[PDB]
Design a protein around this nucleic acid. Sequence first.
DNA 1: ATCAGAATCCCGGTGCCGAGGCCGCTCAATTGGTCGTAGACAGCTCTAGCACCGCTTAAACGCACGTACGCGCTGTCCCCCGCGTTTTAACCGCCAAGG
Lengths: 64, 95, 91, 80, 78, 103, 105, 97, 97
Amino acid sequence: IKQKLETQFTCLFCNHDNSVVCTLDKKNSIGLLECKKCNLSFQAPINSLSQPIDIYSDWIDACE
Amino acid sequence: RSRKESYSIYVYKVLKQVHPDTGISSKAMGIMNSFVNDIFERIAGEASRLAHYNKRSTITSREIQTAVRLLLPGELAKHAVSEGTKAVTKYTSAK
Amino acid sequence: KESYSIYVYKVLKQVHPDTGISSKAMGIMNSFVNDIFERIAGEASRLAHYNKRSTITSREIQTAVRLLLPGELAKHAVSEGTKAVTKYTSA
Amino acid sequence: RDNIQGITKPAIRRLARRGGVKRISGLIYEETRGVLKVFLENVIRDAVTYTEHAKRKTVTAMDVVYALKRQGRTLYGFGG
Amino acid sequence: NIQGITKPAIRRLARRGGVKRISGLIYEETRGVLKVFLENVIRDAVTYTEHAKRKTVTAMDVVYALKRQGRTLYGFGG
Amino acid sequence: TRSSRAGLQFPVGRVHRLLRKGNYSERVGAGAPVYLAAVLEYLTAEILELAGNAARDNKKTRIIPRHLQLAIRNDEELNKLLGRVTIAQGGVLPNIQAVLLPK
Amino acid sequence: AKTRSSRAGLQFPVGRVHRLLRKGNYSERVGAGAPVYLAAVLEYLTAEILELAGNAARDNKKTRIIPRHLQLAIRNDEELNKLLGRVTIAQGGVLPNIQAVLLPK
Amino acid sequence: HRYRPGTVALREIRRYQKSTELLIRKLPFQRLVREIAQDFKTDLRFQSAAIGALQEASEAYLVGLFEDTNLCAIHAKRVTIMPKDIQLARRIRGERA
Amino acid sequence: PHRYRPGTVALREIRRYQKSTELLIRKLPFQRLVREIAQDFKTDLRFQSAAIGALQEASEAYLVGLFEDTNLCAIHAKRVTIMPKDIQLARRIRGER
DNA sequence: ATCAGAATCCCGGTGCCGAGGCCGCTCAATTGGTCGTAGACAGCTCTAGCACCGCTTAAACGCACGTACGCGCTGTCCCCCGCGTTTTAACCGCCAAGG
Ligand SMILES: [Zn+2]
């Protein structure tokens, strides 16, 4: 079953903190970051061990 | 709050003119707004081609007339040209 | 009132360098080039007005070439355009 | 007058053969003439309208090019 | 996948089209042509959203892509 | 407002603004938007007049878009105009090939 | 290199295209990389289609490209044919379409 | 008892020329469209109004193409559709080469 | 003599006209028909020849496309003889009413 | 034709909800005033569109005539309509045992 989790991460674009939601679909190995404020979205691959800090880390490197 | 556009009140008044006892749905009002958008866009594109096939950059009403009777079919077009021309006379005759 | 004739000659000598051409063939080619230029440019102007961007950079041109030409042509064209951007940007 | 009847049956034949048509019925020719006529009606109406705004009493090749681009039956070859 | 298209759906498509009598291979042929249609449409739609630098395809971009295929549809703000 | 001074119903200066921001030319004349607005005005008058007749047919008071699509598909020149046009909640002509009617 | 064409190593005039954009009523301002980018796309399209032109003209032992060659090379392509679907060439004609029901068997 | 064929179909043609409501219902159509876009890009949250737009355009498109295909078959001295009829209509419109 | 029960004549001339390059309708009567249609909306108009040649080109192309789809309609009709309602169906599908 | 009976139409009914009135804002249309060149216009020049004809000839027209695809008919055989029978997509309420 999918996991819809709220986090305390800051969006890299709109800068609103505590407004990034992480949807981890392990059945298809696809993780999804969403911003509850400016509405941006970022997709990245996840394994079985990953957690909201794993894809949020991949989002920091995808920008820089 | 960003201010968005509609043409709803204008054509709404026109509808009230031509049919006082008539209601309308909201989606259809949006459809008519899109209708005005589309017709305006085709006209304006023909106006830009009028410019570039005439090597001029001024727009007068004459170009609008020839654009309309390029786009629209004949009888409807000539009635519309009549309406626009009489409006040109009534406006520019006064200030 | 310039046509693109020697440009065509130089492309032709870069590809099939032992090849002639008729006059009206060149005419159809320049008709073609003008059509393509107009279609891309107008689509880029649509990109601006649909996106409220007061000018146009190369990124708009890339996405417009995507919007007009299909896959293989599109990818090779994006490659050639970025390579030209690279070599002009280096010097 | 009657240049609509200037359309010849062997010309329609030749057009069918380059068109690849083998067998020709007899009830075809005037129907063909009518369709060709309506086509050219819309074409020359639009071309003459382009020349109406041109304020020149002579229509150019460029005019007909632009008008047929307006119909979307767009033809190259002569510039425009 | 593509087999989410039911037989009575394409039958209802014949009915609003007004078509009476139905053959067999129609169904899979229909799904194929619908697929290629949506392929071109959503490809250039996602191209629009690629230029938008945003993660959600707008309804506007859908409308403009329909205009780009000469398939102008009113109704939804276009 | 120039529209009232033209005795019409569409706002001139909004159109004059949109002509400027459309890159439609370099300069914009005086009364060209008046002419264009009147063209729009007669077009929508004719369209919605037929739509009003369409509502008179079904005895409906609020316009549904089905009325709009029907009134488009009835008139000749309008349907040749909007040939490449479709509308959500449109539908088509109630039309039956009588060769497929039974005997 | 004084000229931007030599600075791009290409064959088209870029400032031509930039003036075309300026004398286009296309945008209000035009950047520096877009005209180069578009001209490069044009140059690729020319070379790409002239490849099929060269082979199609070489099919008939003729040094000169005729319009029939161009129409043949377009219709023998797939991407260019779906490109040029609403498009007609002067002095073109169409492909040999002999149906199988027609040959004397 | 049993009714004689062809009748109910035309009666529901007269019924289905009336409501312009969407024929394909939402969820499976949405899954198909999502499974398609994914092939072009990832993480693309669809506006639901855009989904309705796709649905409308697709259904009207297919209905009109059916109308031309039906008239092809009526010309073909038959009543029932064939896949070759769809090929003929598409060959006239020019989707496929 | 060598009367030849048919088949080589038509298909051979198809081979010739598809080896061909140039036009088929000859110039003058087409020009006079053009001027007769032209004499209907604004009188007394003059013309350059290249316009007329473009008109002839696009005219023959338009009719060639009509003939191609008409031919495929006939092949689907299990016939080789054309019919007028073939052309009417072709223009029905082309949206050029 | 002709009756029985499915199928659909069509008339109060009520409900609920969004179309439309309405009302207090503020930002673009306006109003007025100031440079400026694009174009409306006068006018010069040479091209080309037009008309005409004489000569050449290949192209159309009419007919002779067989003939062979187009077609009406036929039998036939088969496979979609449809109505019936489950049946599963789609969508809300309980046991796991681990925390
Ligand atoms: Zn954000």
